[PDB]
Symmetry: D2
Subunit: 726 residues, 4 copies
C-alpha cells in the first residue's frame, strides 16, 4: 500500500507552475524559505516519515484496521481504548467558525519599509528599511460559511498580522475603503440582514435577497459600500489583484508626541483585476475553491503576492477641512485630495503546513496595535475594539488563544496573567500580582519613550455629554456613492447597473425594489433610470426632479476609484488555456510556450480526454485536464494552435470553451486552421480587436496576445456579446 | 526596588527544613534536580526577572495601575485594550474541577525497577534496572471540591503517570485495596450518595450524612470499603504514610504471550500512620491545607516521599482457586495467600512550578497502558475505561488534552488525528489517513513483539449471552469486612466503632442508622453491639443470632491489613513542637535539637508572641509561631525544656497545647521544672508510659522520646483520655 | 418498597425548628410559598414519585444495577448506550466555579417598598408600596473555592437579583461599605495576591499569607477594607446578622431627569452579630457548611432572613 | 459534548422527548430541568426509590437487550466472511 517506485507521489521541493506537481504543505514544498516566525513554529511542527503510528499517549498501534471484538463477527468491546481515542479525537475536530469572514485563505510572508518613518511614527516596524517583519495574511469573503465558495459577489477581508519586535500589530482591513454602517452598535443588524435569513438559512454567500435590500432601503448610510459591492470590485479575479484598505482613520504618534491622522492602503503589485458576474457566478459551481487554489499555486510557482503599503496622512489641524467627517467610515478620502504615500512592501512567499492549525485558528484583531500607533473616535472602530477579543473566547476556546502557535508573538511577553483553559505557559514567577516585593516587582512597567517604551494613549481632548447620538456631520449619504459612480468607466457603470438589476430581481417583495430605486435616484438619475428599466419600474416626476448631491470638495470624479481607468496590468502569474488536437503543430506550440514563459504566464494543455497526445514531431504532450474539467472560467485567455483541427472542430465542448471565453471578454488567439473557429463566435474575415489570428503562432502573434492580456479583458467587445448564446 | 536590601525576600535554593524559608516553585527551589520529563517542559517554562510587563501580544505596558478614562475622574473608555485583555484573562481563569478527586496535591519524581521483569512482562519501563522512568504523582481525597480540606475522613487517591519510552502508563490507584461498588454502571449512584446532597449542597468532604448511609444500607457490597473508610485508614497522617493499591486485577503479558494476573501495590517507605478522628477534624479547621503543605515541605527539605512498587501475581490457571472472584473489586487478595513481590522504587523529588498548569491540568486515566500490560473483565475497571477519556472533553476543553505540557508523552507520538480545539501540533504529513500512498503510508503500524512492538490485546476467551447481570460469584458481602475487622488491633477496632458511631449520629433519619446496624450484625456481633450502644439501639434476638460469615480461604485474620499490628515506624521528617519560655535552659535545648537533627526530625519553636526570646546563657532563639498559631494538631510530639516555667505555667494556650497533644496520644517530654505541667494533664508522680520526664534533657531523655515517636502514638493512653476536658 | 412503613423518611411540609426534620428541596418543604418568579419556574421543575426511571431520551430502563456484558463475568459491550449515557452525564457534571465568590448560599424571597419613591427615581419596582418584587439572593465568601469553608475570615458578598416588571436589576453588594482597591485595572493583582499562591495553591479561604500582606504593604489604598476584614466584621455569626452595602455611588433618576447620587445599604432586622476568631476557625473544621446550613434551616423554621 | 456544549443536549427543545423522562442524572452545563427529587441516586429509601426501574414486558416495559450468544477470543480481526 505504498508509494510508486518512480517517486511520482512526492512534489518537487522547487518552484513549479500551477498543475505541474501535486500541491504540498509549505515546509515540504519550500523548506529553504524562512523567516523568524516560520522558524519559531518549529517547536510544534510534527513530521511523519519513518515514525511508528501511535495513540496520542505514545503507544504503538499494531492493527489500525479493526475494532477489538469478542470473536471476529462479535460485538465491539468497551476496553478498545485505541478505537475510542481515535474516534473521540475525530468527534471533536470542529470549532466554531468566525461569525463573519468564515471563508478565508492565508499565507506567510515578510514586510519591510522603504525608508524610516520616524518623523511621523515611532512604530519599530517602520523605523528601518532593513528591518524585516514576518507577516501572516488571511484574505476572506464576509457573509458565507467556511465551506462557501470563493468567487461570490461580496466584500473581501484582507487581514495582516505583523510580528514586530515591539509586539503583534494586526491591520485588519477590507478590499473597499469604507463600510456599510456608521456605528458598531448596528453591526449585528447589518450582518443579520446580509446573512442567510433566519427561518430557512438561505441564501449562502449572497446579498441578493429581501432582508439585505430591506436594510439598505431603510439605512441610506449603506449606499456607498453597496455601490462598491455592486461594481466589479465585488468579484475580484484573485486576492493578488484587489486593493486593501484599513477602513478607519487611525493615528500615527512620533517620538515628539505629535499625532497624525492616517488611513492605510495596500496596492496590489500585480494590478487591479476583477471577473464579470456571469463568470464569477458560474465559477462558484465549477470551482468553489478558485481563489484559495490560485493563491496557493501562485506561491508554489514563485509568483509571490506582493503589496505596497501606503498611507493617506492628515495633520491634526486639518481634521475639519473636508466636507465629510474624517471619523465617518462610510466616507472615503479621495486620493485627489490626499495622496497615498508609499511606505513599504509585503511579499507572501510561503503557504502554511496545516490549514486548520495555522489558518482556521489564526486570530486577528484591530485593537492589536503597538507604540507609535493609536485609535480615533471613529464609532465603528470603537466598537470593533470590544468584539475581536470577546469572540475568541468561544471560537478558540478561551483566553489563552495567544498561545496557539500561529498567534504567538515573536517579541517577548511576560505578565501576571495565569491559568485559563489549555494553559501552555508554565510561569515560574513567585509572584502573580504587582506591585510585589517577592520578585522585586518583575516583570516591570516601562515608561513610554522613543523606542522600546510602554504604550501610552495619545492625550486626545474629550468634551461632550454622555449621549447615544449620531454626529450631525455623519448625516450625508449620497455624495460619495455619486463620486464613485462618476469615477467609473462606461463599462464599469454598466456592470454596476447590472449588479443592482440582478440582485433586486431576486428580491421577492416588490416595494423593496422600488424603495432601493428611489435611493438610487438620490445618487444619480442615469443610474436610477437604468436599474428601474431593468426592473420594469418607471421613475415618478418627483424622482426625476431630485437634485443630485454636491461634489466632494469640488471633485467631479477621481480616477483612482476605478479598477480600470488607469492601466496597471501585470501578466506575470496569469494563465492561458491551450486547446490541443491529436496532431499539434509543434512549431506553433514551441513559439507559444516560449513567449508565455518570457512574461511569466502559465499554460494548461487541454484535450477531449486525459492521458497524452503526440505532436507532429513526436513530442508527447501530457494533458492537464479536459475541456469540461478546466473551463475557460479558470483562465485569462485561450490559444488554439494549428494541426489536425478536424479532430476538435465539431467537439461541442471545444466550441463552447471559446464561446464562454468570448462572452467573458477574454483574449482568444487562433493559429493556422484553428481560424475555422471564428465561425463559432461570429468574427468577420477582417478580424476583430480582441481576436488574435495569423497563419502561425509567431513573435508578432504572441506579442499581440500578450498585449491584450496586459489590458485584462476586451471591453470593446461588450456590444457584441448580447447575441451569443452562451 | 521593592525587594528588601538584605535579599530576605528570596528563598535559599537548597534543601531547608519546614518553616525555615518561604516555599518556592520547584525549578527555583531545586534548579539542579532533573529528569527527562522535567527537561522536556523547559520549552514552556516562562521566567520573569529583568523582563518588561507586556500584553499577551508582547506590547509593553507603561501604566499597570490605571484604566484609560476621559479625564482623571471620568468614564473608562472602550478603547482600553490593555484593561480588557487583563480582565478578560482573569474572567476566564477557572476550568471545571474533576468530578471526583477534585482536591489533590502533586509532585514530580522518578521510578526505577530493582531488576528486569522480562520473564513476566514485556513492559519496557520494567525491563532494565538502569532504566529510569520520570513520574508525576497526584494524591487526592475523593468527595470534596478542589477548595475542600485535606484531613477529612475519606478514601484517598494515589495516581502515578509514568512517562515510559513506549508510551504513558497511568496507575490510577487509591489507598485501600478495594472499592465500594462492583459494576461501573452504579458509579454515579454511589458518588451522588456520598457527595453533598442536591437540594442544599451539604456536607463538604464528609460521608456523615443521610444519603451516603442510605445507599450503604441498601447495597451491602459497599460494606468492605466502608470498613476501611471508618478505620483510621480514612484519616492518614501524610500522603507519605499511606499504602496505595491499583484496585483491580490487571494482566502482565510477557514476550511469549503468557498472561499473569496482577494486583498493584505501593508500600510507603516512611511507614504507615494515621491521625485520630478528633485531631483530623479539628485540623481541617486549623489548616485545611495540611497534607498539601506537608508534601511540598517534605520535598523542599529532602524528605523525599518514597514508595516501593509491588505485585501480587496469580497464574492464569489459578483464576478460580479462591473463595472470592479475582474480578470482584469489592474483594481483596490477602497477602497471607498471595505475597507482594517487590518490583521497584519511586522517589518524589521536585515540586511543580505552577499548581494550575501542572497539577490542576494533569489528566490520569487507567486505560493508559503500554505493551506488556492488559485489562481483565473486572466490571468496575471495564466502565472506568470509558470515563477517564470522556470527562477530559469538558474538564480540559477538548481532545487535544495530551498536548497540555504536563500530559505530553516523552515517547514519540505520530498518527493521523487532526484539528480539535487548542490544536498545538502542526502536522506536515501530506496524508491524514491510512492506508495512503502519498506519504508511503507513514506513520506505519508496528507488529507486536518482545520490545518496541505494537499493542495487541491478550486473546482472552469470551463466552456467554449479552446480559445485564451480576456474576453470582460476586454475591457475598460480609466475609471480607469480617476479615478486615478481625485483623485490626483492639485500639484500631475501637476507632472503627467510633467512626461508624460518629457518622451514624449525623444521619437524621433513625431507621437508616438501624438498617446499618443490621448490616454490621452480619459482619461481627461485637462490632454491631458496640455501635448500637453508642446509638441507643438494642439488637433483636434475631440479630444476636446471625451466623458470622465464613473465613476467607481458611484465614481468621491477616496482619498486613492493620496499620499498626506490625511496627514499621520511621521518624525521619516528623516534627516536634518545642514550647519556649522567656529564659530557656540552653543546655536542654542544645541536647534536644542535637538528637532531633541526628534522626532527621524537625522542630518548631513556639511562644506566646512572635520575635525572639533569650536563653539563660544569652543565646537568641527565633520564634516560629505562637501556641495558637501552630497547634499541637500539626506536630508529632511536644517537648517542653526547663527554665523560667512561671512565664508560661498560667498561659491557657500553653496548657491547652499539652492537653490537646495528650488527648491525641502524642508523645510528650518534660525536663526539669517543665515537670510542673504534669498537673495539667493529670500525670501521677511516678510518671506514666508515653510521658518522658527527667531533671535535664539528656542522658537517655531524647532516646526515650524518639523511641516513642518511632511507635507513632501512645495507644496505651486511650483509657485515660476520656477524663480530660480537651 | 424501600421507604419505612411509618413514613418517617419524608419531612413534614410545615415550618419546623432546626434538626426536628430532615431538610428538603424548597418546593417540597413549603409548597404554598409562592411569588411570580417561583411560579414561573414551574415549567422546568421536575418531580419523581410514581414515574419510571428512563434514559434522557425517554426510554424506560429495566436494570439500573448492571452494564451489558458478554456473559455475567465477561467484558462490557460498547453497545451499552444506557451505561454510556449515564456515565457521560456524570463525567460532565461540573462547570467552572466563579472566579471570586465561588463559595455561596442562596434563597428565594420578595421585596416591597415602604412608600412610593417616584419623587427621586422612576424605577418601577420602587414606585408603589403595593409593588411586590420577587428576589433571589446569594451570600458568599470571596477568596475560597465552592468547596471551601463558610466561617473563614473574609469579606462576604450579598447579591440580590430583583425580578422587576421593567427588567432584572442586580444589586451586587458586600458586607462592608468599601473595597480594597480604587481602579478595576488592579482587580486581578489584588485577587491574585489574596488567593492561594500560585506555586503550591495554599492557603484556602485565608488572607493570612505573604502575598496578600505584600500587596497590602505596597498599596496603602487597601488599608481601609483591610481594617474591616481584620475586625469581627470578617467573621459573621450568620448571613442574617451582617450588613450589606452597594459599595459604589450610583445615581437615581426621576421622571424629570433629575439625578441624585445614591449609596445602597441593607440593614439586617435580626441585628449585627459576629463570631470570635478562635470559634470561627475551629468552626471551619467542625462544620465548614455552618452558614449555608444556618440559612437553609432558618428559612425552614420560619425565621426568614429580613433586611431593610 | 463539543457540538452542543455538554450532556444536557436532550433539553435543547427540538431534541426533547415527548415521552416522560425521569432519572438520577444531575447538573452539567446549561442545565434546564430543576429536579425536586430528594434523592439523586438509587437504590434510595428517602424517595421510596422513585423513579423506579420497569421490567421488560409486551408494552410500556423497560429495555432489555436480546440475549445473543457471544463466543470467541478478544481479537482485532476482520471476519473472513467480509473479504
Ligand atoms: C475595515 C475592515 C473591517 C470592518 C470595518 C469590520 N470588520 Fe470585522 N469581525 C468581527 C467583528 C466586527 C465588528 C464588531 C465590526 C464593526 C463594528 C466589524 N467586524 C467590521 C469579529 C467578530 O471580531 C471577527 C469575526 C471572527 C474574528 O476572529 O473576528 C471579525 C472578523 C474580521 C476579519 C477576519 C480576520 C480573519 O480572521 O481573517 C476581517 C478582515 C475583518 N473583520 C475586517 C473588518
Ligand atoms: C481503583 C482506584 C480508583 C477506582 C477503583 C476508581 N477511581 Fe476514579 N475517576 C473517574 C471515574 C471513575 C469511575 C467511572 C470508577 C469506577 C466505575 C472509578 N472512578 C473508580 C473519573 C470521573 O473519570 C475521574 C475524575 C477526574 C478524571 O480525570 O477521572 C476519576 C478520578 C480518579 C483519580 C484522580 C486522578 C488525579 O487527577 O489525581 C484517582 C486516583 C482515581 N479516580 C482512582 C480510582
Ligand atoms: C473588575 C473585576 C471585578 C471587580 C473590580 C469587582 N468584581 Fe465582583 N465579580 C467579578 C468581577 C469583579 C466577577 C469575576 O465577574 C464575578 C465572579 C464571577 C461572576 O459571575 O462575577 C464576581 C462576583 C461577585 C459577587 C458574587 C455574585 C454571586 O454571588 O454570584 C459579588 C457579591 C461581587 N462580585 C461583589 C463585588 C463588590 C462588592 C465589589 C467592590 C465593591 C466587586 N465585586 C468588584
Ligand atoms: S471600514
Ligand atoms: S478498586
Ligand atoms: S465597593
Amino acid at each position: 500500500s505504498l508509494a510508486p517506485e518512480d517517486g511520482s507521489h512526492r512534489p518537487a521541493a522547487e518552484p513549479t507552475p500551477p498543475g505541474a506537481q501535486p500541491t504540498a504543505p509549505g515546509s515540504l514544498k519550500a523548506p529553504d524559505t524562512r523567516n523568524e516566525k516560520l522558524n519559531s513554529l518549529e517547536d510544534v511542527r510534527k513530521g511523519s516519515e519513518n515514525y511508528a503510528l501511535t495513540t496520542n499517549q505514545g503507544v504503538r498501534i499494531a492493527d489500525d484496521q479493526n475494532s477489538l471484538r469478542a470473536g471476529s463477527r462479535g460485538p465491539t468491546l468497551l476496553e478498545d481504548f485505541i478505537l475510542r481515542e481515535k474516534i473521540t479525537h475525530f468527534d471533536h475536530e470542529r470549532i466554531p467558525e468566525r461569525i463573519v469572514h468564515a471563508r478565508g485563505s492565508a499565507a506567510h510572508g515578510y514586510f519591510q519599509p522603504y525608508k524610516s518613518l520616524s518623523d511621523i511614527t515611532k512604530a519599530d516596524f517602520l523605523s528601518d528599511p532593513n528591518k524585516i517583519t514576518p507577516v501572516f495574511v488571511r484574505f476572506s469573503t464576509v457573509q458565507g460559511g467556511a465551506g462557501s465558495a470563493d468567487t461570490v459577489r461580496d466584500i473581501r477581508g484582507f487581514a495582516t498580522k505583523f510580528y514586530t519586535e515591539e509586539g503583534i500589530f494586526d491591520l485588519v482591513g477590507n478590499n473597499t475603503p469604507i463600510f456599510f454602517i456608521q456605528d458598531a452598535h448596528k453591526f449585528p443588524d447589518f450582518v443579520h440582514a446580509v446573512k442567510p435569513e433566519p427561518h430557512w438559512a438561505i441564501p449562502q454567500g449572497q446579498s441578493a435577497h429581501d432582508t439585505f435590500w430591506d436594510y439598505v432601503s431603510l439605512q441610506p448610510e449603506t449606499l456607498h459600500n453597496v455601490m462598491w459591492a455592486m461594481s466589479d470590485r465585488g468579484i475580484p479575479r484573485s486576492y493578488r489583484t484587489m486593493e486593501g484598505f484599513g477602513c478607519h482613520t487611525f493615528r500615527l504618534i512620533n517620538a515628539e508626541g505629535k499625532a497624525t491622522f492616517v488611513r492605510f492602503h495596500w496596492k496590489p503589485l500585480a494590478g487591479k483585476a476583477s471577473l464579470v458576474w456571469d463568470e464569477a457566478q458560474k465559477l462558484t459551481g465549477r470551482d468553489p475553491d478558485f481563489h484559495r487554489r490560485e493563491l496557493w499555486e501562485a506561491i508554489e510557482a514563485g509568483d509571490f503576492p506582493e503589496y505596497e503599503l501606503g498611507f493617506q496622512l492628515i495633520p491634526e489641524e486639518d481634521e475639519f477641512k473636508f466636507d465629510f467627517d474624517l471619523l465617518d467610515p462610510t466616507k472615503l478620502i479621495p486620493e485627489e485630495l490626499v495622496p497615498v504615500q508609499r511606505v513599504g512592501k509585503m511579499v507572501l512567499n510561503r503557504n502554511p503546513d496545516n490549514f486548520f492549525a495555522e489558518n482556521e485558528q489564526a486570530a486577528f484583531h484591530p485593537g492589536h496595535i503597538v507604540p507609535g500607533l493609536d485609535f480615533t473616535n471613529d464609532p465603528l472602530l470603537q466598537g470593533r475594539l470590544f468584539s475581536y477579543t470577546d469572540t475568541q473566547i468561544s471560537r478558540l476556546g478561551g483566553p489563552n488563544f495567544h498561545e496557539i502557535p500561529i498567534n504567538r508573538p515573536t517579541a517577548p511577553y511576560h505578565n501576571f496573567q495565569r491559568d485559563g483553559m489549555h494553559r501552555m505557559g508554565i510561569d515560574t514567577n513567585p509572584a502573580n500580582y504587582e506591585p510585589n516585593s517577592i520578585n522585586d516587582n518583575w516583570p516591570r512597567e516601562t515608561p513610554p519613550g522613543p523606542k522600546r517604551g510602554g504604550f501610552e494613549s495619545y492625550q486626545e481632548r474629550v468634551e461632550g455629554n454622555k449621549v447615544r447620538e449620531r454626529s450631525p456631520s455623519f448625516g450625508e449619504y449620497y455624495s460619495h456613492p455619486r463620486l464613485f459612480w462618476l469615477s467609473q468607466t462606461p463599462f464599469e457603470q454598466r456592470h454596476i447597473v447590472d449588479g443592482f438589476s440582478f440582485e433586486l430581481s431576486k428580491v421577492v417583495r416588490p416595494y423593496i425594489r422600488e424603495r432601493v430605486v428611489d435611493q438610487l435616484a438620490h445618487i444619480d438619475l442615469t443610474l436610477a433610470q437604468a436599474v428601474a428599466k431593468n426592473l420594469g419600474i418607471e421613475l415618478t416626476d418627483d424622482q426625476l426632479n431630485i437634485t443630485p448631491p454636491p461634489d466632494v470638495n469640488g471633485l467631479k470624479k477621481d480616477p483612482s476609484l476605478s479598477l480600470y481607468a488607469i492601466p496597471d496590468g501585470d501578466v506575470k502569474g496569469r494563465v492561458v488555456a491551450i486547446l490541443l488536437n491529436d496532431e499539434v503543430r509543434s512549431a506553433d506550440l514551441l513559439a507559444i510556450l516560449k513567449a508565455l514563459k518570457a512574461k511569466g504566464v502559465h499554460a494548461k494543455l487541454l484535450y477531449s480526454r486525459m492521458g497524452e497526445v503526440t505532436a507532429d514531431d513526436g513530442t508527447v504532450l501530457p494533458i492537464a485536464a479536459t475541456f469540461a474539467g478546466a473551463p475557460s472560467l479558470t483562465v485569462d485567455a485561450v490559444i488554439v494552435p494549428a494541426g489536425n483541427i478536424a479532430d476538435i472542430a465539431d467537439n461541442g465542448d471545444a466550441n463552447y470553451y471559446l464561446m464562454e471565453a468570448y462572452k467573458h471578454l477574454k483574449p482568444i488567439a487562433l493559429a493556422g486552421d484553428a481560424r475555422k473557429f471564428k465561425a463559432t463566435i461570429k468574427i468577420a474575415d477582417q478580424g476583430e480587436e480582441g481576436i488574435v489570428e495569423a497563419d502561425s503562432a509567431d513573435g508578432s502573434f504572441m506579442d499581440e496576445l500578450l498585449t491584450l492580456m496586459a489590458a485584462h479583458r476586451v471591453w470593446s467587445r461588450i456590444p457584441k456579446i448580447d447575441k451569443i448564446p452562451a
